[PDB]
Amino acid sequence: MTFVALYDYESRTETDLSFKKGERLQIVNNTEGDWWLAHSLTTGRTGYIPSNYVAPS
Amino acid sequence: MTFVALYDYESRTETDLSFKKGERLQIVNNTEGDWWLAHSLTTGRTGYIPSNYVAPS
C-alpha cells in the first residue's frame, strides 16, 4: 500500500505531485482509475486519460 | 491495444486529453508508466505521480 520514491520528480502541471527520492507515498483510491497516455484515433489528439472512462475493443 | 471511450471527458489541465463517448483511443507506450493519485506521508502533499518513479515498501 505504501511506496518509496526512487527519484526526484518536479511538477509540470497544477495536478501532479512534486517529490524527492526517499519519500513515502500512499496511493489514493480514486474513481478516475490509473491515468494513461493515449492517442485518439478519432481526433488525432493525444494526452492523459482516466482509465476508468474507457474499455478495450 | 485499442480502447473505446465510455463517457465524455473534458480536459482540466494542459496535459489531459478531451474526448467524446465512442472515440477509439490507443495507449501510448511511455517511460513514465501509469499515473497514480498519491499522498506523500513525508510532506503531506497530494497529487498525481508517475508510477515508474516509485517502488513498493
Numbering used by the authors:
A (entry chain A), B (entry chain A): 84 to 140
Question: Which lines from the publication concern this structure?
Answer:
The c-Src tyrosine kinase is made up of six functional regions: (i) a N-terminal fatty acid-acylation domain, (ii) a unique domain, (iii) a Src homology 3 (SH3) domain, (iv) a Src homology 2 (SH2) domain, (v) a catalytic domain, and (vi) a C-terminal regulatory domain.
All the crystals of the dimeric form of the c-Src-SH3 domain belong to the hexagonal space group P6522 and show a single chain of the c-Src-SH3 domain. All the intertwined dimer structures described at this work show the presence of a PEG molecule at the interface of the two chains forming the dimer. However, at temperatures below 20°C, we did not observe the formation of high molecular-weight aggregates after several days.
